Design a binder for these strands. Structure first.
Lengths: 204, 98, 143
RNA sequence: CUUGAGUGCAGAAGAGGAAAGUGGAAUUCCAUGUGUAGCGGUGAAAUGCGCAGAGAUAUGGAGGAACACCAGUGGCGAAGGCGACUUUCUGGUCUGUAACUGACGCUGAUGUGCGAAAGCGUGGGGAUCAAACAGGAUUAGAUACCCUGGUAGUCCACGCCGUAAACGAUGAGUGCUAAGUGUUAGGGGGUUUCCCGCCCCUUAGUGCUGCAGCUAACGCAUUAAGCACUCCGCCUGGGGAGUACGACCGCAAGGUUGAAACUCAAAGGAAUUGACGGGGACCCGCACAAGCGGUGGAGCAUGUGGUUUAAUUCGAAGCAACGCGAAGAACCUUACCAAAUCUUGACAUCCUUUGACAACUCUAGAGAUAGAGCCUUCCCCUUCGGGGGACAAAGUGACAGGUGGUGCAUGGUUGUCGUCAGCUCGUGUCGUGAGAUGUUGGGUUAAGUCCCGCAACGAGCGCAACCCUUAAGCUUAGUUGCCAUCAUUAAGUUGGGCACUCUAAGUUGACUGCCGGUGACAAACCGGAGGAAGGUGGGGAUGACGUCAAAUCAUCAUGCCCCUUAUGAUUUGGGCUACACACGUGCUACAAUGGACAAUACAAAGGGCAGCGAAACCGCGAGGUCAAGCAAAUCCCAUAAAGUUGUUCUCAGUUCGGAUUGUAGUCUGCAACUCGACUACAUGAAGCUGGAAUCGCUAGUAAUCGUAGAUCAGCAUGCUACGGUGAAUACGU
C-alpha cells in the first residue's frame, strides 16, 4: 500500500519495456545514454504532444519510434526537420539513429495527451471541472470501459490544498488483467503546483 | 518523558513548572513509569502555544493535548483533562450466583 | 487444534521417552538430550537395578495428578484433567524439577528424581499433594 | 309544551366515609426448658452479639403495628385517596320506568370549604423501620454509597399548616362525526324441553387497535389533541426571579400576590445524520487463555535526549522516532567551526573578443592557488575571408546560487487504523423537511460470501478471483549438469548414455469436484472416497471511501518571502564520536544440558574482469610471495556451524567469564592521534539468570548455529537474502 500505479504491477506481464537494448552490465553508460534522449523530447512536447517513446538498440544502431498525434508536424512537409533531428541527436548521442514515427491511432483517446491537455486549459484560467466534463464526455464517446480523473493542489488559484475526481465507467484496478494506461501531469500558473492522475480502462 | 521543545528552548523554569504539576496526581497514583511533553510554536501567524502530553498508565495510557495563547495557559488548560481522562477506572463489583 | 503426535519411542519400544527427550531437547539439540536421558536409563536401571518401567511408570503414577484447578469474580474451580494434560504436566514438573535438585551430573538428578518419586517422595510427589490440597479445599465455592 | 333539568316508581353494585367492636398470623422482647460454640452480616471484612450460655429448638406471656392469598389495564371517589371482618349512622352513583312539575339550566370573578407525604403545638402510646446521629469498612480523600446499631418521627385523638411531577404534563358543560376488539353494573329480545349453558340489541363507565380530520412532529382519533357554540382562568424571548420591597395569612417554618436595575441574541420543542456509553445482542482477533522464550539485573554497541562546545550540523518521537533518515562521518562526505579566499562568482546560457581545448617541472604556498618557464596550438569545412564541434581570458547585464525560511502555500512520495469488511451512486418510492429505502429481516461464509424474504430495482469501488512462488505428474530437450548398464580415474577423470536426479517452458492436475448425510429441497454446512495436494493447499503481490492540518521545502520540483561582495562559492585542519547521567534497541557473560583440546559427517543461496586469486612457499596468525583457471551449471570465492567420536576439566567468581589497559605486529589509505579493523603476548572487570513491572510466538513456528550479498580504499553486535537443526502449548472465549 497505500497505492501504486498498476503499470508497475502490470509490467513484466502485459506490456513491453519502455526502453530496450541488449543485456550487458554497461548499464550506467547506456541507461544514462537513454536519458539524454528522454530529456530532449520535451522540446517536442511543446510542439508534438506525444504520449511516449520506447527505444530499441540494434547491434550497431538505434531505433526509436515516437507515439504522436501530430504526424505532419513532426514529419514536416517532406522531412525538413527529422534529419537535422537525426544529426542534432547524433551530435549528442555520439552515435547514429533511425527514427521512425509510430503515429497514434484511435486517436486522441490516450491518457498522457488528455492529461497535459486538461492541465493546459487549466493553465489558461479555466474553471477546472468542466474541462474534465468535456474530457469524460469525449472519452465514453470514443469507446472506453472505465475512467476516472483526479486533480490536486490549490484549485481556482485560491486557499489551501484540495482534490477532486469524477469517476465514471467501471474501472478494474485491483485486478491483474486490466491493461490500462496510467498517466500524470504537472502545470501551475501562479499558485503552487496542480498535477493530475488520470485513469482509463479499454481492453484486456 | 522527552520534554522537547520545537522552536522553543526548554528552560529549567519550564521543567520545574511541568513536573511540579504532575506531582499533584499522586492522588492517583504515581506509579511513575514515564511521561512525555510535546510543545511547539506553530505559526498561524497568530501562532500558538501548542501542548500535547502523553501519560503511560498501568495496563494502559492516556494522551492529552490542547492549544492556547501561551505555555502556562496551555499547561493549565490541558490540566483538568488528563485527570478526568483518568478518573474513574474500576470497581466493578462481584458476582456470580451461579 | 490436534496435538502433533510422536510415533513410537525407538528405544525399548515405549513412547513417552520421545515426549520426554523433546522436553530435554533445548536449543533444538536432540542428540545431547537423547544422550543424557538414555544415560539416565542406565543409571536408574543400575541403582537398585530393575526395568525402566518399574521406577518410571510407578514414579509417574506417584506424581501424575488427577485433579487440577483453573481461575474464573476470581473463583478457582477444581477440574478433571484431560489425560494428555495430566501426563503433560507430570513430565513438566519432572524435568522442571530435575534441574532444581542443584547438582552436577546429567543423570543422577534425573535418576534420583524418578527413584525418589517411585518411592512417593520429593517435590513432584509434593506438587501432586499440594495440587490435591488445592483440590477438595476448593471444591466448595467453584465446583 | 316536554325532548332539557329534577322529584317520583321499581331495580343494581360499590377497597365511599366517620365512630365502635372482635379475630389470626408475623416481628421484637421476656420467662422457662433443651443444648454447645459459634451467630450475624459483607464484593471481601470488621464494627456487634456469645461461657453471665448466645443463636437454634420448643411452650407460654407481653404489647404496638400493619391486615397475606382473593387483587383484575377491576371497582368507588369531585380531587387527594380508598383494600382483615362485623356492627351503627350516612352520602353518592348507574339502569329501566314514567304519571308529577313545567326551562326551574350551564359557567362562576369575588367568596367559601375539602386536600398526599413532610412538619409545629397540647397529650398519649411507642413493636418494626429509619433522617439526624455514634461506629466499622470502603476511598488518593468519603462528611456518602456499603455493614453495625439508634433518636426525632413513623402510630391514635385534637388542632394548625394549605404546598407537589396535586400527571391524562390535556379547564367545565352541550351536541354531531368510520370501524373492530375486549372488561365492569344493568336492562330488553331470541334461542334452550329450563340458557346455567349461548346468540342479538341497548345504556353507563372502562381499556386496546385503528379511517377521516387535525398535527411543527411526536401523535389523539366517540373517554378527540377532530368539528362548532357558551363561561372561567392563564401566556407574551430567556436570565435576573417566583426573587426584593410592600400587603394579607400563619405559633413558626414558610405561604399567597408579585416587580424592576442591568444583562444575553439567543433560550427552547419534535425529529434526522454522525459519534459516544462507566448500555445491551452477536461475531473475530497471541486480545484472552494454555505454553515457551525474553526486556528490565551485569559489560559492549548504536540512535536519541540531557550535558557540553569555537562546532559539537538539520529533521524525524505514543503504538506509527529512538540499529531512522544516513544501505558505510579519519580527509571526502559535512550541512558545522577555524583560518587562508573569490565575487556575472563554485558552476550554467545568452551578447562581445579569440581559440582546437594544456602536459613536465621550478619558486612559494598548508593547499587553494598563484609567479614563470612552458606547448594548449582552428583539427570538419574554406574559392584566399569565413562557417564551425570546442576554446582562452576578459567584458557584458540579465544572471548564477542559496543545505536561507515556510510539509499549515503545495505537488510528488509514504506510514497509520486495516488486509478490517465495508463504502457510494443512477432510477423510482417515502416523507413538509432534513433524511431513509437499496446497505434492512432468516440462514450461511474468513468477507456486503451466497441464497431466501422484502418499494425497491440496478450499477460502481472494495473481498475472492485474475498474476508470482511453492507441493505431484507428463512432455520438450542433455552441457559445464547426472552415472542407471558398463569399462575406467585419486577423483564422472576418460569413453560413452541422458536412463536417473537436475535443468527452463507448456502441459494435466484440486474446482465441494465425487459421493454420503444435515439443511426453507436452496444457500450452505458435517462426513467419506480417491488424489501429490479438499474446502479461497501454503505464502507473495495488491492496502476501498478515508482519518491523523501525520511526515518530507534536506529526493525532485515549486507558490510566497529573504539574501546577493554575501544567508552565496573555493582551500588546509578540526567536528558531526566529547560524558555526572538517563531512554530505547541489539549484542555478550553469568557454565557441567557445560568450558579446553584432538579426529570426522551434512546445505542453501550468491559474487567475480581484471575481479574471483587454486595449489605451492613464508610465518604464532593477521597477512606476504608466486602464479594455474575463470565473465561461469564449469574455475575460484569457500570451509559450513550446530553436530558425531573421544580426552580432560569436576562446580571455584572456576580453563566460567571476557570488558579493561599496555606491548609487538598485518592490511588499506598520501594520511589509522581527536576517529579503521584485525593478528601474537599479558592482564582478567562486573556478572551465578535478574526485583516490581513488561514483550513476542500456533509448526518447520519459536529457539538456536551457520552462510552469502549490498552499502566499500578501508570498515556491519546493523539490514536484506539463504539454509542447517529444531519442540512445548492451543480446553474453551
Amino acid at each position: 500500500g497505500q497505492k501504486i500505479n498498476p503499470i508497475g504491477l502490470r509490467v513484466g506481464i502485459i506490456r513491453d519495456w519502455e526502453a530496450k537494448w541488449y543485456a550487458e552490465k554497461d548499464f550506467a553508460s547506456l541507461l544514462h545514454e537513454d536519458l539524454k534522449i528522454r530529456k530532449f523530447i520535451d522540446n517536442e512536447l511543446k510542439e508534438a504532444s506525444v504520449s511516449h517513446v520506447e527505444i530499441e538498440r540494434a547491434a550497431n544502431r538505434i531505433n526509436i519510434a515516437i507515439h504522436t498525434g501530430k504526424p505532419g508536424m513532426v514529419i514536416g512537409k517532406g522531412g525538413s526537420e527529422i534529419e537535422k533531428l537525426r544529426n542534432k541527436l547524433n551530435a549528442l548521442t555520439d552515435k547514429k539513429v533511425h527514427i521512425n514515427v509510430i503515429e497514434i491511432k484511435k486517436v486522441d483517446l490516450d491518457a498522457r495527451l488528455v492529461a497535459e491537455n486538461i492541465a493546459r486549459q487549466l493553465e489558461n484560467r479555466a474553471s477546472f471541472r468542466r474541462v474534465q466534463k468535456q474530457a469524460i464526455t469525449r472519452a465514453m464517446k470514443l469507446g472506453a470501459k472505465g475512467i476516472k480523473t483526479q486533480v490536486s493542489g490549490r484549485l481556482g488559484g485560491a486557499d489551501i490544498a484540495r482534490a477532486e475526481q469524477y469517476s465514471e465507467g467501471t474501472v478494474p484496478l485491483h485486478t491483474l488483467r486490466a491493461d490500462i494506461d496510467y498517466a500524470h501531469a504537472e502545470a501551475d500558473t501562479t499558485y503552487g503546483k496542480l498535477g493530475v492522475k488520470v485513469w482509463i480502462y479499454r481492453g484486456e | 518523558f522527552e520534554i522537547h521543545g520545537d522552536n522553543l528552548t526548554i528552560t529549567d523554569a519550564i521543567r520545574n513548572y511541568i513536573e511540579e504539576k504532575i506531582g499533584k496526581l499522586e492522588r492517583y497514583f504515581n506509579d511513575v513509569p514515564n511521561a512525555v511533553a510535546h510543545v511547539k510554536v506553530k505559526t498561524y501567524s497568530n501562532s500558538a502555544t501548542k501542548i500535547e502530553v502523553t501519560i503511560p498508565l498501568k495496563n494502559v495510557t492516556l494522551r492529552a493535548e490542547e492549544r492556547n495563547d501561551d505555555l502556562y495557559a496551555g499547561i493549565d488548560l490541558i490540566n483538568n483533562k488528563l485527570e478526568r481522562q483518568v478518573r474513574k477506572y474500576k470497581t466493578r463489583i462481584n458476582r456470580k450466583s451461579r | 487444534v490436534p496435538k502433533r503426535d510422536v510415533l513410537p519411542d525407538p528405544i525399548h519400544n515405549s513412547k513417552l521417552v520421545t515426549k520426554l527427550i523433546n522436553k530435554i531437547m533445548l536449543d533444538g539439540k536432540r542428540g545431547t538430550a537423547q544422550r543424557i536421558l538414555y544415560s539416565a536409563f542406565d543409571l536408574v536401571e543400575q541403582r537398585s537395578g530393575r526395568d525402566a518401567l518399574e521406577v518410571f511408570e510407578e514414579a509417574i503414577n506417584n506424581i501424575m495428578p488427577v485433579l487440577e484447578v483453573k481461575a474464573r469474580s476470581n473463583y478457582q474451580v477444581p477440574v478433571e484433567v484431560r489425560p494428555e494434560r495430566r501426563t503433560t504436566l507430570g513430565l513438566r514438573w519432572l524435568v522442571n524439577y530435575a534441574r532444581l535438585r542443584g547438582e552436577k551430573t546429567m543423570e543422577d538428578r534425573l535418576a534420583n528424581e524418578i527413584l525418589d518419586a517411585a518411592n512417593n517422595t520429593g517435590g513432584a510427589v509434593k506438587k501432586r499433594e499440594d495440587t490435591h490440597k488445592m483440590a477438595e479445599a476448593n471444591k466448595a465455592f467453584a465446583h
